[PDB]
Amino acid sequence: TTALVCDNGSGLVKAGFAGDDAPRAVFPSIVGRPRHQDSYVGDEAQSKRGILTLKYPIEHGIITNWDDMEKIWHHTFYNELRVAPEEHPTLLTEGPLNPKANREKMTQIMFETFNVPAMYVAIQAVLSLYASGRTTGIVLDSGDGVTHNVPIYEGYALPHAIMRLDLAGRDLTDYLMKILTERGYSFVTTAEREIVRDIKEKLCYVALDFENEMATAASSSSLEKSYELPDGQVITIGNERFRCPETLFQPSFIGMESAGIHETTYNSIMKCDIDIRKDLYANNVLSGGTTMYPGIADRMQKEITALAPSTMKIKIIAPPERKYSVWIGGSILASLSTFQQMWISKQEYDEAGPSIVHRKCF
Amino acid sequence: YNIADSNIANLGTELEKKVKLEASQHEDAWKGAGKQVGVEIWRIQQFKVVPVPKKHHGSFYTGDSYIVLSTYHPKTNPDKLAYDVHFWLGAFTTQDEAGTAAYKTVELDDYLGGLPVQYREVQGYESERFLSLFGGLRILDGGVETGFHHVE
């Protein structure tokens, strides 16, 4: 009996089998329907996006379209992994500070619709910490939907210090779409959002000094890059390369009053007992696709140093495979019989209902 | 945000501790652990916690990950036991081994009622406390194979 590990990101499904070193199915968490007013899921919807309007059932880490989310799960099991879910204990994931009903409904659907024999819902950042070989550290987990700050000491996340910012990759993509209009480009539709997402992933970077970089961009074309659109047109982008992810450090770029990711990290550490802060500062673990911008670790190191006491030893850990750290941590933990001992069985669900998830999954 | 209506409302509770203590009862490696002063060592082998024979304690394969439980008498009472738990990560250990060692360190901590103080010991970065447990510290070439199946 092999457990399935499914990390339902806001933007990407990562799914596979416990004990594998990587997810075997990675595909967009999207359902597409005809743009002219019956549905396609995942890679095929992305392929046929020329004639489809694309919708994400997860927004900011919360499932907001349950009918479409069921399509995503059905596709993951039957079309991608090609498994019968009733034969496989299933590990799902979730970001912290989600409303309780999100995991209640995940649990209900897994048992009542997919008939899984057992399941567990794990906190994403905790999986990433274990994937890094640590029991103590502070994880900055940023995917398509949410940026979370999760401090963990001796294997226990510290709930009073967990912080959440509903600003992540999708907001960055949308902002790149907007600023690209300054150059006279028009990216508006859901299909165009996916093109700009690709531009963002390929060409964006975090500047070490934002104002200096803006000056460099105006002095010459040395920072410019070209990109070929699917229709063949070649566009040029310049300071948008770094203005886009600057939003993580200056959320006011998209009109949010929130502190930037460096300040939230600092604030989360400061909510922890003083005696453990040095260990957290020396163990900032980056996780998620939105932490993949070139330059982000160096910028974090600079900004946290400016906020922290002058002698504080600060280290940013940026695992090269951090797009998959959550999944990998799940694959490891789901390979351990003692971890599986805590999973909800189908009988337990039959007798206790969705409320049992809160009493078994931590 | 409101912790109370959220999926972390039960973190930090007696309930969380109870569930995790129960889970730790299902690992044979912990039975009889920490019963007298000394050092006990396990190596991760394809996700399993495998005892290291006492005659090898202090020798560690650079390709592997280990858990080292140091049981001692605290200053407060010479007839009671306290614990440092170190997890040692070889320079060439694979991700599955280090991650299992971390998770299982927390589990041993749970099994021992939270009393162990945890220490992450990367090869070449071992703490003063770790160095004090053992020319008894010897690093060996090689190690056991990863538990991961490689996806091509």
Ligand SMILES: Nc1ncnc2c1ncn2[C@@H]1O[C@H](COP(=O)(O)OP(=O)(O)OP(=O)(O)O)[C@@H](O)[C@H]1O
């Ligand atoms: N190299 C890259 N540079 C910048 N952004 C990237 C890069 N690679 C991926 N991303 C972005 O990361 C996001 C997807 O990453 P990931 O799979 O970790 O997120 P997720 O699990 O779907 O989201 P969440 O966990 O927040 O619900 C997208 O916004 C994507 O464009």
Ligand SMILES: [Ca+2]
């Ligand atoms: Ca090994």
Ligand SMILES: [Ca+2]
């Ligand atoms: Ca402890």
Ligand SMILES: [Mg+2]
């Ligand atoms: Mg994610």
